[PDB]
Amino acid sequence: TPIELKGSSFTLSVVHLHEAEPKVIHQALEDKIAQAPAFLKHAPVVLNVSALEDPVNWSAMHKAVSATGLRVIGVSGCKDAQLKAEIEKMGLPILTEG
Amino acid sequence: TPIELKGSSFTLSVVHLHEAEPKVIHQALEDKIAQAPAFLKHAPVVLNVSALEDPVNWSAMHKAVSATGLRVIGVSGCKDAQLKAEIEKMGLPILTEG
């Protein structure tokens, strides 16, 4: 009675990563935020990694994204075993699309 | 090309909180997680507070929920600017719920 568990859809902003170096991502997110500063400043985002080939230093990637003001709520599209196992270690949840 | 930002829909676990004491909520959550551990461990959750009432210690509730391993990524169905205000302090986003 105290809780109920449900499954519901939420639209979230997704950052689809295509290059891997944190600094390049930081610069690119900066430019993107400037396209709608009032909405994208401090926006909660999900990091999608489906299109990544090179390995990603996650702690460093998490800091580079966070430094732009964006707030990382988790990671999606992670279709690797180890890699998945990695992300979940720093308290970051894995999210899946509907 | 290094980045894309677009909205996507995500099917999420929503814990609907009802009238109660952080210890009780922590109790109820552990019992749910135990029934489906393979799926529920470190799951991302949204906390729906629409059924809560005037007095509620948000810091105590968030700590209790997080203690179960669940990863609170946002709050939904909020009903006052007070509680709301207390939520964005810790940087938790507010979500709208399908």
Side-chain angles (χ1 to χ4, degrees):
Chain A
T1 59
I3 60 166
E4 269 162 346
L5 177 63
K6 294 206 187 314
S8 304
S9 297
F10 298 89
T11 296
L12 302 169
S13 302
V14 181
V15 170
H16 290 259
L17 299 177
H18 281 99
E19 183 178 2
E21 173 70 15
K23 185 168 176 268
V24 170
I25 300 303
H26 172 89
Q27 186 74 257
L29 288 175
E30 259 206 12
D31 304 332
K32 182 69 198 57
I33 294 170
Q35 287 186 323
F39 299 88
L40 290 180
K41 177 153 111 186
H42 311 139
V45 304
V46 179
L47 309 184
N48 183 291
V49 296
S50 291
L52 282 176
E53 209 74 294
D54 291 359
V56 160
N57 190 338
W58 281 113
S59 78
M61 180 62 64
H62 181 103
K63 185 193 180 175
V65 173
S66 301
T68 64
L70 299 174
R71 294 177 293 176
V72 185
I73 48 192
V75 180
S76 74
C78 187
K79 282 300 135 62
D80 189 331
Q82 200 69 30
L83 185 63
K84 207 177 296 166
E86 289 306 311
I87 286 120
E88 198 163 296
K89 293 179 179 179
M90 40 195 304
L92 291 188
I94 281 76
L95 303 124
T96 184
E97 296 79 10
Chain B
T1 189
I3 294 169
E4 306 187 22
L5 192 95
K6 293 179 179 179
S8 297
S9 195
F10 293 78
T11 167
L12 290 174
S13 300
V14 178
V15 176
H16 286 69
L17 297 181
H18 294 265
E19 316 187 319
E21 187 131 46
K23 183 178 179 180
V24 172
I25 298 293
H26 178 87
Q27 182 86 286
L29 281 183
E30 294 285 4
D31 284 329
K32 291 248 193 186
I33 298 174
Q35 309 316 308
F39 300 107
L40 285 188
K41 243 72 185 300
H42 304 166
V45 300
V46 178
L47 305 182
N48 187 280
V49 302
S50 67
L52 298 183
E53 293 179 340
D54 291 342
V56 42
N57 187 3
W58 170 248
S59 68
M61 182 68 82
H62 178 279
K63 191 186 173 179
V65 175
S66 293
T68 62
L70 299 181
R71 304 285 155 76
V72 183
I73 68 176
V75 178
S76 70
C78 178
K79 277 174 49 177
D80 76 70
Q82 179 49 230
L83 173 65
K84 205 177 182 182
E86 193 171 350
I87 295 167
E88 296 98 7
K89 294 185 168 153
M90 82 199 310
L92 257 53
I94 307 285
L95 305 186
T96 305
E97 211 186 66

